[PDB]
């Protein structure tokens, strides 16, 4: 009867940023998801293909739980379908999505009144990222005739700015922390259940 | 029918406390969240508070932290926000307005009437 | 910290105009609303997500446009709608500083 670890991804002290989200495969379950049922402080309980009220009898093989620090405006792109910054050149989700995404409101925890500039976010891509990957190239777009070695300037931009995060920005850009379950069930015996 | 009830402005020394109340009637009231809008007599709106559906968050700007605390008791079906050491900027017309879901990310759907309070003398 | 810039501060037209209201950001902000605040009483809803209308009002009122601008087209203004805009987003802490509308 051993308890799987959503402890171990929900009151974490470091989520990591959105352009390396950190993916962990959470497998062997005796999942009870009625700890989350008693958690009143959720922003967003919204589940896509599923419904809430019947999470708890239904059994999968294997739950993806995602995690990353977004702007509170940018929740409203962690969705099928939508575009945007975040989905389009960040994290993108597919059009058959039958999981859930929980969103937070971390202004106490995730802000000084200095910047806090750990947190990184991706500017564009030559493409729109394929669902479910990850994007940590980091070095300059060139697009010019001049080789600029690395450093930063005209016609050489650096992909990767950096937010503020202070506590007197606005509710929509203090930063959530947003947390996407993506289940499965693909042709195996499940394990994820009660 | 909706309709929002305010009262217990006036004038007050700068640096009294007082309470600004609302009351609410006509629809579920633990499940609509609520937020107070000021405004200078410049007419110009900014929020001076915001409170979550079931009274778990409660946010304020940068000017008016601490100072400023909004409270929320469902069975009167009423709405406090008890302000504390005002400075002489704060007077305004504070209008209480009812959001359209459970966050403070929705729409503003119903309003008050307003109530003065202007700080002086 | 963003700031909202609602150009200009009076803009005028009379009885068969049609004219539009900008609401511009200062780093790109997914939705806005539209209040009307007529002389004397609260200010009320008529756009919320940037294109709809509340119930209630005219439909010579729509809005258009997202990422960094926001336009509020009028029809044709009648002398009911000599008013305040405000364009507000919950990402703000501020509001706009309101255009009016005067009869020509």
């Known amino acids: 009867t051993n308890l799987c670890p959503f402890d171990e991804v929900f009151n974490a002290t470091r989520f990591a940023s959105v352009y390396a989200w950190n993916r962990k495969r959470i497998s062997n379950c005796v999942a009870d998801y009625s700890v989350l049922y008693n958690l009143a402080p959720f922003f967003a309980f919204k589940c896509y293909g599923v419904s809430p009220t019947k999470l708890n009898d239904l059994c999968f093989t294997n739950v993806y739980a995602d995690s990353f620090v977004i702007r509170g405006n940018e929740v409203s792109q962690i969705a099928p379908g939508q575009t945007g910054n975040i989905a389009d050149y960040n994290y993108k989700l597919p059009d058959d999505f039958t999981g859930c995404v929980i969103a937070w409101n971390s202004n106490k925890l995730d802000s000084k009144v200095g910047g806090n500039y750990n947190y990184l976010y991706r500017l564009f891509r030559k493409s729109n990222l394929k669902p479910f990957e990850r994007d940590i190239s980091t070095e300059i777009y060139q697009a010019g005739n001049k080789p600029c070695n690395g450093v930063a300037g005209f016609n050489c931009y650096f992909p990767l700015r950096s937010y503020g995060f202070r506590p007197t920005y606005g509710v929509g850009h203090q930063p959530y922390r947003v947390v996407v379950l993506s289940f499965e069930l693909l042709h195996a015996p499940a394990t994820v259940c009660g | 029918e909706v309709m929002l009830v305010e009262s217990g402005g006036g004038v007050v020394k700068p640096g009294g406390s007082l309470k600004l109340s609302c009351a609410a009637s006509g629809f579920s009231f633990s499940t609509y969240a609520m937020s107070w809008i000021r405004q200078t007599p410049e007419k110009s709106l900014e929020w001076v508070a915001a409170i979550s559906s079931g009274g778990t968050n409660t946010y304020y700007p940068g000017s008016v932290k601490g100072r400023f605390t909004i409270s929320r008791d469902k069975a009167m079906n009423t709405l406090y926000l008890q302000l504390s050491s005002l400075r002489s900027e704060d007077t305004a017309m504070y209008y209480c307005?009812?959001?359209?879901?459970?966050?403070?990310?929705?729409?503003?759907?119903?309003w008050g009437q307003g109530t003065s309070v202007t700080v002086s003398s | 910290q963003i700031v909202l810039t609602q150009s200009p501060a009076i803009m005028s037209a009379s009885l068969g105009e049609e004219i539009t209201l900008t609401c511009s950001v200062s780093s790109s902000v997914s939705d806005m609303h539209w209040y009307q605040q007529k002389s004397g009483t609260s200010p009320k809803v008529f756009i919320y997500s940037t294109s709809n209308l509340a119930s209630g009002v005219p439909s010579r009122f729509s809005g258009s446009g997202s990422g960094t601008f926001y336009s509020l087209t009028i029809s044709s203004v009648e002398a009911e709608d000599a008013a305040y805009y405000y364009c507000?987003?919950?990402?703000?802490?501020?509001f706009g500083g309101g255009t009016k509308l005067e009869i020509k």
């Open positions: 307005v009812r959001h359209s879901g459970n966050y403070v990310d929705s729409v503003m759907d119903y």
């Open positions: 507000h987003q919950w990402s703000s802490w501020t």
